[PDB]
Amino acid sequence: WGYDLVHSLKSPYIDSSYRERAEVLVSEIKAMLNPAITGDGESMITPSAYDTAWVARVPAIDGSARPQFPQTVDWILKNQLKDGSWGIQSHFLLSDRLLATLSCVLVLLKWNVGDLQVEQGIEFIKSNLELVKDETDQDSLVTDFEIIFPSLLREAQSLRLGLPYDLPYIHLLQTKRQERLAKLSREEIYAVPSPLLYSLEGIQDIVEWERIMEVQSQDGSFLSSPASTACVFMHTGDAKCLEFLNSVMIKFGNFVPCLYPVDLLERLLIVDNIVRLGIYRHFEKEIKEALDYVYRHWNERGIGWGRLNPIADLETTALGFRLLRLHRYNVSPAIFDNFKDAFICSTGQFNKDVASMLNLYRASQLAFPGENILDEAKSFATKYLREALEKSETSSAWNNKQNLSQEIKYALKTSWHASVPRVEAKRYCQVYRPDYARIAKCVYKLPYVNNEKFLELGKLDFNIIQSIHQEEMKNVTSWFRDSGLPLFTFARERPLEFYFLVAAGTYEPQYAKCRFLFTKVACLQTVLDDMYDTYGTLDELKLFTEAVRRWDLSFTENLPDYMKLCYQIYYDIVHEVAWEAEKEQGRELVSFFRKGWEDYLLGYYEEAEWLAAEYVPTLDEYIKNGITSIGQRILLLSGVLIMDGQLLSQEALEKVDYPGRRVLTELNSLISRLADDTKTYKAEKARGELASSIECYMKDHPECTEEEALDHIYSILEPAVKELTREFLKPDDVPFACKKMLFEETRVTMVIFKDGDGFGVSKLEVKDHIKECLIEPLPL
Numbered sequence: 175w176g177y178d179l180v181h182s183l184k185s186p187y188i189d190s191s192y193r194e195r196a197e198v199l200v201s202e203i204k205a206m207l208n209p210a211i212t213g214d215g216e217s218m219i220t221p222s223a224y225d226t227a228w229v230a231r232v233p234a235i236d237g238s239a240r241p242q243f244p245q246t247v248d249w250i251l252k253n254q255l256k257d258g259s260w261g262i263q264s265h266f267l268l269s270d271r272l273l274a275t276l277s278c279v280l281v282l283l284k285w286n287v288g289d290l291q292v293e294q295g296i297e298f299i300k301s302n303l304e305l306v307k308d309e310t311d312q313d314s315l316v317t318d319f320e321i322i323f324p325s326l327l328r329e330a331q332s333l334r335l336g337l338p339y340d341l342p343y344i345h346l347l348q349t350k351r352q353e354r355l356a357k358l359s360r361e362e363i364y365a366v367p368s369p370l371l372y373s374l375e376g377i378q379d380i381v382e383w384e385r386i387m388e389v390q391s392q393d394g395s396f397l398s399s400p401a402s403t404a405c406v407f408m409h410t411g412d413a414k415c416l417e418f419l420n421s422v423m424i425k426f427g428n429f430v431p432c433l434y435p436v437d438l439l440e441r442l443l444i445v446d447n448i449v450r451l452g453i454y455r456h457f458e459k460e461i462k463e464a465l466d467y468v469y470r471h472w473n474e475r476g477i478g479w480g481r482l483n484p485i486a487d488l489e490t491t492a493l494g495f496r497l498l499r500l501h502r503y504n505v506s507p508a509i510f511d512n513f514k515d516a517f518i519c520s521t522g523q524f525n526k527d528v529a530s531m532l533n534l535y536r537a538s539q540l541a542f543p544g545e546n547i548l549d550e551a552k553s554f555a556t557k558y559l560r561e562a563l564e565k566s567e568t569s570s571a572w573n574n575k576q577n578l579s580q581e582i583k584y585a586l587k588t589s590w591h592a593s594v595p596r597v598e599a600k601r602y603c604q605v606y607r608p609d610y611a612r613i614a615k616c617v618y619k620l621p622y623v624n625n626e627k628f629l630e631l632g633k634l635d636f637n638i639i640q641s642i643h644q645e646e647m648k649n650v651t652s653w654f655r656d657s658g659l660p661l662f663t664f665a666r667e668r669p670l671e672f673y674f675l676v677a678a679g680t681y682e683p684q685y686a687k688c689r690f691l692f693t694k695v696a697c698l699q700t701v702l703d704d705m706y707d708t709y710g711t712l713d714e715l716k717l718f719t720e721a722v723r724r725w726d727l728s729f730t731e732n733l734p735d736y737m738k739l740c741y742q743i744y745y746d747i748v749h750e751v752a753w754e755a756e757k758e759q760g761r762e763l764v765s766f767f768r769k770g771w772e773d774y775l776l777g778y779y780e781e782a783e784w785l786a787a788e789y790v791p792t793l794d795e796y797i798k799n800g801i802t803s804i805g806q807r808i809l810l811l812s813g814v815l816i817m818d819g820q821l822l823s824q825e826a827l828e829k830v831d832y833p834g835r836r837v838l839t840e841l842n843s844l845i846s847r848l849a850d851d852t853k854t855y856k857a858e859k860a861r862g863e864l865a866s867s868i869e870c871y872m873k874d875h876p877e878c879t880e881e882e883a884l885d886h887i888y889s890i891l892e893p894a895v896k897e898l899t900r901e902f903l904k905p906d907d908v909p910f911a912c913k914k915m916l917f918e919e920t921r922v923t924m925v926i927f928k929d930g931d932g933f934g935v936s937k938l939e940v941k942d943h944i945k946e947c948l949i950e951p952l953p954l
């Protein structure tokens with residue numbers, strides 16, 4: 175550990191060639207994304223054999239005995255898979271292959287073509303249906319499979335095709351179809367848009383075609399589905415339906431996808447993946463352009479996956495809420511009222527429902543003060559997700575291949591606030607799939623979202639940043655060794671731990687000085703802390719505290735030897751930080767730093783007076799002192815004022831730092847103090863130590879239990895965390911890098927003190943985080 179471990183690291187990724195390569199990947203990605211963000215190549219989505227067959231059904235509008243879109247028939251004839259099914263070869267999903275293959279077989283028969291393809295398709299359907307033994311054999315279901323397949327299969331039956339109509343699995347599907355159709359509000363199909371509009375081709379006996387146009391989308395589609403739209407067209411001759419089908423053929427040539435457009439969901443998925451991979455700083459322009467487009471379409475009624483959908487989609491809306499708020503757009507959680515009754519969204523296909531609830535769960539964590547609906551949403555989504563873990567569908571072959579249960583479990587154990595940013599990006603680089611397949615009416619892919627380039631850059635960029643940090647850690651440990659700080663054997667050496675505290679969140683190459691000075695101050699503080707609350711006597715501390723007031727090295731003659739050394743190091747670190755800050759900021763700051771340091775150490779001294787007198791403060795007194803004496807304020811200032819290119823006027827600084835006000839540095843101090851207490855108070859009790867916030871509350875409330883005491887401390891933390899989030903994301907004219915640096919240090923602090931029971935900080939967890947974040951590179 176420490177010096178020896180760090181100087182033994184020799185990362186190759188520090189060489190300029192690796193960053194030059196990463197820059198080529200960045201340019202390649204910008205080019206790849208340009209059509210989706212700036213051009214007209216939006217909605218890049220794979221073919222739906224199922225939907226393409228429905229479009230192929232449409233007869234020529236001139237009344238002749240041939241398809242209106244003959245190119246779709248040719249596509250179908252040329253794209254059969256080797257086993258006789260139609261679908262995407264890379265992924266096998268039984269229900270997808272069954273639906274698509276039966277769909278294709280029937281349209282080839284309609285036009286009396288493809289004898290061989292039909293024969294092979296029928297064989298695939300028969301043989302695979304006969305392999306189904308029980309329900310747990312069916313695997314994941316494409317959207318509305320239970321409704322559509324029995325309908326399509328009855329069409330085949332009327333043609334007397336050689337299919338096993340009497341299989342128990344087939345009877346079960348008809349049973350499920352009835353179960354679904356029973357909850358249907360039929361009169362309302364015509365007045366209130368609903369998810370069933372996506373699949374009208376499966377409920378043809380139910381729909382009064384003469385009434386259905388009232389819920390058609392503006393582009394002429396029925397909920398973006400080419401198949402459903404084609405069906406309505408064949409029954410009505412509706413001109414707008416035909417325009418939609420034409421527009422999709424024009425865009426894709428000789429096939430159609432199962433959803434179109436997917437302009438809103440695709441943009442949001444692009445941004446989500448770039449952010450989660452940790453590569454977002456290379457794509458500020460593209461992310462703004464994507465989110466700007468989403469925001470233009472953002473409205474009080476929510477958003478669908480496509481901007482023309484006549485009903486909002488929880489998946490897209492929750493994802494949009496989160497990314498918009500995260501990028502400082504003004505959104506209200508009131509949009510989730512669109513998904514409420516008397517919450518629901520427990521209808522639909524399983525992966526979509528799970529996705530919607532994962533997105534709602536994540537969105538709920540970005541709550542601002544007073545946003546009760548998000549607390550409710552968090553509770554609801556958590557319950558939903560824990561239930562989903564217990565459902566058989568979660569363990570289907572398809573879901574297991576994508577580690578769905580693992581993903582749900584990880585989401586539930588992961589708090590956005592209590593996250594290590596660099597570590598989350600590293601972990602996501604290990605989960606992200608370039609060939610990820612999604613489910614709707616058919617299995618599909620979105621290549622702008624899931625591709626090899628994103629991951630290549632993610633892994634390389636992570637390794638390069640890490641290698642830069644490793645060189646910085648050599649500098650840190652080298653400075654530490656020669657600094658004099660190791661001479662204080664009453665304190666533990668933790669330079670890498672403090673470097674991690676800042677570097678795991680504020681990682682960008684240009685902020686090396688920020689990280690370095692932050693680390694120096696944190697190393698100094700840990701010695702000062704031990705000196706004031708443990709090692710020093712009150713009379714010694716009174717002397718040291720007087721020296722603090724005087725800012726005079728000559729006055730040090732009066733101090734004990736160890737304090738002479740401590741004062742010298744402190745004095746030097748304070749003024750190095752101040753000089754660097756004055757250089758960056760172009761204004762005087764020595765006086766401002768000196769006052770910050772005096773208030774901090776005078777805080778320690780008040781605390782030391784209490785300890786010596788065995789005085790237990792009121793909780794008000796304790797928190798008042800603790801916000802000042804915890805030391806986060808002056809530590810944060812020692813980093814935030816020295817960020818390359820980030821100018822903070824006095825006016826701007828006061829927006830994020832102002833003792834006595836609920837601004838970022840104050841909220842961090844408060845959260846740190848109380849979070850620490852929640853994590854450690856029991857160890858300090860059994861050690862006969864200085865009272866914590868818990869003990870202070872119990873003195874204030876002699877009748878209350880320890881449990882009630884801890885509960886109260888949490889009732890203070892939770893509101894503070896919400897305020898911290900709003901202060902961070904709030905639109906203002908404070909350089910955002912500075913706000914982010916403050917917030918991210920808080921997030922890493924919250925990781926260290928998470929799950930506050932008794933009981934102590936986990937030294938092993940800390941070491942493991944440092945290993946993962948700073949020591950071990952990603953394999954390429």
Ligand SMILES: CC(C)=CCC/C(C)=C/CSP(=O)(O)OP(=O)(O)O
Nearest residue numbers: 665666700703704707850854934935
């Ligand atoms: C605290 C543990 C588990 C061992 C580290 C020893 C050491 C560096 C003491 C830190 S003093 P601390 O526990 O943070 O209590 P505070 O004065 O910060 O409220």
Ligand SMILES: [Cl-]
Nearest residue numbers: 607609610611
């Ligand atoms: Cl996959």
Ligand SMILES: [Mg+2]
Nearest residue numbers: 703704706707
């Ligand atoms: Mg202390």
Ligand SMILES: [Mg+2]
Nearest residue numbers: 703704707708
């Ligand atoms: Mg201490």
Ligand SMILES: [Mg+2]
Nearest residue numbers: 850851854855
């Ligand atoms: Mg403690």
